[PDB]
Design an enzyme around this catalytic site. Structure first.
Site, mmCIF file in Angstrom:
data_model
loop_
_atom_site.group_PDB
_atom_site.id
_atom_site.type_symbol
_atom_site.label_atom_id
_atom_site.label_comp_id
_atom_site.label_asym_id
_atom_site.label_seq_id
_atom_site.Cartn_x
_atom_site.Cartn_y
_atom_site.Cartn_z
ATOM 1 N N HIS A 118 0.778 -1.346 -0.007
ATOM 2 C CA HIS A 118 0.005 0.070 0.165
ATOM 3 C C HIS A 118 0.811 1.120 -0.084
ATOM 4 C CE1 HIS A 118 -3.537 -2.276 0.385
ATOM 5 N NE2 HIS A 118 -3.020 -2.953 1.274
ATOM 6 N N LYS A 176 -4.526 -9.958 -7.713
ATOM 7 C CA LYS A 176 -5.141 -9.212 -6.663
ATOM 8 C C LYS A 176 -6.256 -8.451 -6.977
ATOM 9 C CE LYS A 176 -4.181 -6.947 -2.124
ATOM 10 N NZ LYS A 176 -5.209 -5.560 -1.995
ATOM 11 N N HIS A 205 -3.447 -3.335 7.694
ATOM 12 C CA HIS A 205 -4.182 -3.248 6.818
ATOM 13 C C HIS A 205 -4.758 -2.094 6.385
ATOM 14 C CE1 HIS A 205 -7.981 -4.954 5.259
ATOM 15 N NE2 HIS A 205 -8.835 -3.706 5.991
ATOM 16 N N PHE A 206 -5.167 -2.071 4.942
ATOM 17 C CA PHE A 206 -5.720 -0.842 4.371
ATOM 18 C C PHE A 206 -7.188 -1.081 4.151
ATOM 19 C CE2 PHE A 206 -5.243 3.083 1.981
ATOM 20 C CZ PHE A 206 -6.478 3.167 1.550
ATOM 21 N N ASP A 207 -7.850 -0.429 4.834
ATOM 22 C CA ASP A 207 -9.323 -0.660 4.904
ATOM 23 C C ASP A 207 -10.430 0.069 3.996
ATOM 24 O OD1 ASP A 207 -11.122 -2.732 6.639
ATOM 25 O OD2 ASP A 207 -12.462 -0.762 7.048
#
EC number: 4.6.1.18
Length: 124
Positions: free
Chosen positions: A12, A41, A119-121
């Site tokens: 990210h 992905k 984590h990228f939400d």
């Protein structure tokens, strides 16, 4: 094995560019960051900010993650981001993506000591 924090950086972060420079940004970056090696992905976001500025989000506005976890945080400020998501023609191993530029707040999940993104939400 790769830590969750390191995985977040690989998936990210792109501190090396200010924005996506062409329609091929996602194709190139998804490949280079190994996000297409095993399977395409489907969607991914890259953040064009310093690492410290993104890590600092973990001390910004708490909000529940999409999945309900309570260790999510929204940035106070908008950030330069690139949204990557598969085109209709994407077909492993020839993964293909639409690159979209944006300036959005980010939401990340954080863990650890130091307390950092894992984590990228969402972009919001």
């Amino acid at each position: 094995k790769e830590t969750a924090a390191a995985k977040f950086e690989r998936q990210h972060m792109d501190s090396s560019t200010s924005a996506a420079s062409s329609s091929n940004y996602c194709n190139q970056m998804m490949k280079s960051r190994n996000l297409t090696k095993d399977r395409c992905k489907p969607v991914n976001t890259f953040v064009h900010e310093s690492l410290a500025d993104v890590q600092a989000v973990c001390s910004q506005k708490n909000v529940a993650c999409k999945n309900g976890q309570t260790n999510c945080y929204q940035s106070y400020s908008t950030m330069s981001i690139t949204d990557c998501r598969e085109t209709g023609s994407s077909k492993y191993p020839n993964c293909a993506y639409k690159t979209t530029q944006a300036n959005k707040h980010i939401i990340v999940a954080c863990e650890g000591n130091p307390y950092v993104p894992v984590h990228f939400d969402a972009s919001v």
